[PDB]
Every structure is written in C-alpha cells, then in structure tokens.
Structure 1
Amino acid sequence: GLFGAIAGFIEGGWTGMIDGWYGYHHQNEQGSGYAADQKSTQNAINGITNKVNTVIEKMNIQFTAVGKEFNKLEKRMENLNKKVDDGFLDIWTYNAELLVLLENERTLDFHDSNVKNLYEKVKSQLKNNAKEIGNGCFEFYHKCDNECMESVRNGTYDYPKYSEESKLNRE
C-alpha cells in the first residue's frame, strides 16, 4: 500500500477475524484467538459510509429527458441538439469513471493508513516490554493473561506493572 502496512510488512489478512476490519490475534497460556478493534473499525465505517453517501448525493436525480424531432430543413438545429447531448454524456461519463478511480485509491490508502496507525498505537503502548518479531506481531518479555491482553486491546496497558519482569527476561 501507500503506508506499507497492508500487503507490506503485514503480508496477509485474517479470514479468522470476521467481526471487524482491523483487530488483534492473541496467543497465551490460556489459549489463542482473534478479536477485532471496534473503535477504529467504527471510525472507518463512518468515514467510508459518508464518502459513499457523499458520492451518491452529489448526483442529482435525472428527471424527464426525451429526444426532439426536426424536419428536412432543420439539420443544423438537429446536429446542435446532438452536439449538446453527446457533449454532456462525454463529460458525465468522464467525471464518473475518474471520481470512482480516485476515491478507490484514496480508500485503499485510507485502510492502509488505519492499519499502520493501529500498529503504531499498540507499539507505543507496549514500549520495551515486548519485541517486534516482524509481521506486525509482538512477543512479550513477560506473562500476559486474557486480562492483560484486554488491557492492551482497549488502550489501558500498564507498563510499570510488568516493567520489572520484562527487564529481567530481557537481561
């Protein structure tokens, strides 16, 4: 991507995570499991929803537009009418295709950005109590139960609490 997250240092997506766009996968003594991050997901949903709605809204309702007829001595007016119709058609096709392309690119880049942001948030929360084993994962220098995992997920990680143990295991 543009931010190097999706299809970057995080090679693939999780078919296991079915409850959200972005999230986590924990592994400890109590077991392993997927768990989506609801905040970022909700934000992304709101943004993209507003984008789509915003694209549909910008296009007014096309009311009644029918063709006209011209006799054998009005070829000029006929060709003018055609000029008009064809011109408008060209312009609108252009605008449509272009806008869709642009918004698609910006959308994918937006997702990428969200993933990288989440990763950096987690990283900055954990600091040196864990190590980046690559692929968007962190290996703990201490024991982390489901309560600790939850403390990490919902943005309430306690660094000094495990600081000592982590320092010891880090050696």
Structure 2
Amino acid sequence: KYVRSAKLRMVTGLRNIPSIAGFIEGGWTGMVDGWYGYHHQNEQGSGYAADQKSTQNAINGITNKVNSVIEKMNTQFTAVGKEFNKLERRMENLNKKVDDGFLDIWTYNAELLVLLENERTLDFHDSNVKNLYEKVKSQLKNNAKEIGNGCFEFYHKCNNECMESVKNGTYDYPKYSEE
C-alpha cells in the first residue's frame, strides 16, 4: 500500500541508554547476546547472561506485532488517476477529492497504528523487565540486605547450586537465615 508520509519507525528494541551497577542511571552496554539477563559476582566466579523465556515471549510479541501490521492491511485497489474531458471535470474534481481523502485517511491511520503499537510493545518490554525485577525481589525479604540504587546483592556467600537455584527463581529465604 501507499502512504503520503516521510517515515514510519516500526520499532522493536529499547531506548538508547548506553550508561554491573544498575540500569536506573544507565542500561547495560557490554551485553550483546540478547535483551535481558543477569550479571552476578560471588566467590566462585562471575558472568553476564541473557534470559531465555522472557526474551522468547518478547520476540514472539515482536513477530506477532510485525505480522499483524503487515497482515492487517486489507485489499489494494488500482488507484490509477483516470482522465476526463475539459467539460466534464466535475467528475475529475470529485474523483480528485475522493482520492486525496483516501490517501490522507490512510496516512493518518498508518501513523496512528505505528504510534500505538510501538509504544505498547516498548512498554511491554519495560513491564517485562519490571516483572523479573519484582520476581527476584519477592523471596529476598530478609536474607539479602538490598543495597537499593537499582541493583541487588546477596547478604552472604553461596556456590554453584545457589546461583543455579536462584537462576530458576526459588531463592532459599529461610535456609540461610543464621543471622
């Protein structure tokens, strides 16, 4: 289809915030693998990461949004500008009015849909980050003195089994409560 605009920025990712220490002041930069993941350090090692399930649901949302916007445009009509005499152009005037109205209306509709869906998906991404934030927050009521400032910590030490278990999301709150 044709539109009479200059650009419609169908957008997939997140805001360019190039800033380990927290994304409130600035989003992670070294991350390359995906969208959202983890960076923790302990006695046993360290490392970056990118989560899978959140990113998989998100990219499913992306494919749904692109295929929606491409498959939610209906048929196309051969809008060829026809010809009329120098005596009958009331026909021509009305036809030009109709065609300009149609291209105008579709410009408006395409722009509005782009705005709507791009905002909605980017705030979807934001809300996904937030839900993972609150999920990891949940079990940590009293056994990791949360330093604030956007990034978390562990009150104590723990080995590979600890990091894998919290990787799943089942952090052992009462188990390590000896202070």
Question: For this structure pair, what is the TM-score category when the shorter chain's length is used for normalisation?
Answer: 0.7 to 0.9
Higher helix fraction (1 or 2): 1
2:35 to 10, 13, 21: 21
Question: Percent of pairs identical after alignment?
Answer: 96
CA RMSD of the aligned region, Å?
2.7
CA distance in 2, matches of 1:142, 1:33: 18
CA contact (8 A) 1:6 1:112 kept: no
Structure-2 change in CA distance of 1:28 and 1:128 (3 Å): same
User: 3-state SS of the aligned residue for 1:24?
Assistant: strand
The Cα of 1:118 is off from its aligned counterpart by 0.4
CA contact (8 A) 1:28 1:144 kept: yes
The Cα of 1:158 is off from its aligned counterpart by 2.3
CA contact (8 A) 1:21 1:41 kept: yes
1:96 to 98, 110, 127: 110
The Cα of 1:115 is off from its aligned counterpart by 0.9
The Cα of 1:7 is off from its aligned counterpart by 13
Q: TM-score, normalised by structure 2?
A: 0.80
Higher strand fraction (1 or 2): 1
User: 3-state SS of the aligned residue for 2:46?
Assistant: strand
| Pair 1:46 & 2:55 matched | no
The Cα of 1:154 is off from its aligned counterpart by 1.6
The Cα of 1:43 is off from its aligned counterpart by 1.1
Structure-2 change in CA distance of 1:9 and 1:134 (3 Å): farther
CA contact (8 A) 1:40 1:114 kept: yes
The Cα of 1:44 is off from its aligned counterpart by 1.2
Q: TM-score, normalised by structure 1?
A: 0.83
Gaps spanning 5+ residues in structure 1: where? Answer: 166-171
Structure-2 change in CA distance of 1:30 and 1:164 (3 Å): same
The Cα of 1:63 is off from its aligned counterpart by 4.6
Segment of structure 1 superposing worse, 89-98 or 49-58: 49-58
Q: Structure 1 stretches (4+) deviating beyond 3 angstroms?
A: 5-9
The Cα of 1:20 is off from its aligned counterpart by 2.2
Segment of structure 1 superposing worse, 87-96 or 21-30: 21-30
